[PDB]
Amino acid sequence: EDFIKKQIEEFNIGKRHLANMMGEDPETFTQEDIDRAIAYLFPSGLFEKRARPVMKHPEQIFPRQRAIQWGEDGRPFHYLFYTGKQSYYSLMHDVYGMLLNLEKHQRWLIKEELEEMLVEKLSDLDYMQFIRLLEKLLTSQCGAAEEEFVQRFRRSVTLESKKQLIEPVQYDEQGMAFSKSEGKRKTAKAEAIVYKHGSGRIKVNGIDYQLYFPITQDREQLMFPFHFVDRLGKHDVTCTVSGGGRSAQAGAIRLAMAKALCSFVTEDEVEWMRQAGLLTTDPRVRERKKPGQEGARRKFTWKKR
């Protein structure tokens, strides 16, 4: 235990010297100085994130353990000292006493989290018994003080994934309600300019979509979003496609058009499109060619057989 204090004092002297280095007047600096140091005079470069130079006051990094467990002629800090982990059992006894008191009157954390909170290494069945006792307490006459005391060991709900980042209609640049977007499909990117009016054709890369992709699958993919939203003809575009080749560019244009549509579309249809699958990028992307194999995942023939 003395080594902990020795290292703490050594690092305190080191931090004093570090503060004395700078000739400025702010002694209670924040993480800015540590960041500047790691950027200038401590660039390790190790890929890992633990062995990197993260020098910090060990007053909070060095963990703590049970201090003294006895005083004048033994005398621990509780009557459940010989039971191992006296704190947990004392808390359980207090919970049982509160249970009996309430009876007379009338999300959860993980094991590691409870261990870090306390100073005991509890198992799983003891945690289950503690949860059972807490549930019995919450059920025994629903109040307020006890409910808050029990929730202290719990967290809020914090619901996510609900609304969609509605993009503005964008009326600047020109006198047309256009909207930027993008699309990805096996390493590819684009930037479309889907207007709001213009019930006619579409200019794909400055040229009509007749001499660009005579295949019907390309036109079907291009219609995918407009057909899903039912706003077919009433749309003009002057996108600039790049990267990919055929199906990649088709999917990129499809995603760009879907995003441009969702930009200025009712929340209902926006959510329907987002849930149908035509906004994000599927995981089907140019993977890493396996060096220990002939092709992609195709391993050698008589490997295990």
Partner: protein, 132 residues
Amino acid sequence: KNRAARVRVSKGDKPVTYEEAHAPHYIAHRKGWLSLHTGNLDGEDHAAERTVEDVFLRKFMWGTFPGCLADQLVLKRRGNQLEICAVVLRQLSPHKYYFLVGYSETLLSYFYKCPVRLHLQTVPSKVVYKYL
């Protein structure tokens, strides 16, 4: 398995250093680079001669001190500066230390046409990684 530079568990209080305990797939992850020389660079060329010179200097410096170099050096080429960071151990007296250091410095400076200088590793604790 792979024992490129690691040592599996055995006892508890055995001798072992940082370089004497690492895996091949952790050359740049949990382990650093003991030679930040101007050789294996890109798109810059010139690597064979640089590596040869680095190996020669490392072997010469290891042969200098008798029984005091556990790990290799960490050469540094700041243009025309050859900085050595040897893991030297307190051998005997400081007179011999200074004499040998000055002799080697002058010899290397007059031979390689570049200033050379080293510094001992006066630390009462090695860079032990795994307790083993």
